[PDB]
Amino acid sequence: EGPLLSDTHVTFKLTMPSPMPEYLNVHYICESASRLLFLSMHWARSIPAFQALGQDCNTSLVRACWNELFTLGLAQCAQVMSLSTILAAIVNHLQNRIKQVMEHIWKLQEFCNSMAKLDIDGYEYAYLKAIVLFSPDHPGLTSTSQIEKFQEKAQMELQDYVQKTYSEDTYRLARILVRLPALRLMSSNITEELFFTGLNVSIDSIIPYILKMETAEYNGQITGAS
């Protein structure tokens, strides 16, 4: 009956560590990817239904969908992150599995371009993330029935928003939902390889830490940096 998301869930503000370094810097790429990962998880924690599920269930959910959540965030933040510049630099350090990583990079580029071409807005991205977060398809979850109802509310709220905001674009909702399968064509293992493993990082292991961290000290350090 009541809504899954509020207008508060539209805000998704990534702070990059600095302007693009002159030369390939793996630390800058991973720091930027890690800020996006932290923001995606801190955004999920802001949803009342997510908090209501409890720590066991909501850790299992993120462990199952983090790569899809993270990739929607890559598409949303592509301009802010200069993602096109970052992917080019990885392809070159690569070219100077190998061919798996290349196909993955190509899939990520095509996904990010498909979302830009549709002008996906902040509301549409929040609902798309909620639809991937509350997917009942994953074999781990315990409480399929309740997660299914949360996913159905996200779908209904996205349709109402698209009908109210883009009334003349009859086919927009269908166009946006047919982007979601593209997220599952991208291996979480390769995302981890491309943006994290190197700096030695299992995302599955650190997810519980990110979900429990106090965000005040973290956000102060991010915002108070040069």
Binding site: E31, R35, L199, N200, S205, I206, A225, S226
Partner: peptide, 23 residues
């Protein structure tokens, strides 16, 4: 202007804690 590796420093702490706790 200059990067502060805030998120990397948290991840380094999380990794270190998880390795102690398991294996």
């Amino acid at each position: 202007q200059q990067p502060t590796y805030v998120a990397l420093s948290y991840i380094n702490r999380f990794m270190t804690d998880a390795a102690r706790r398991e294996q």
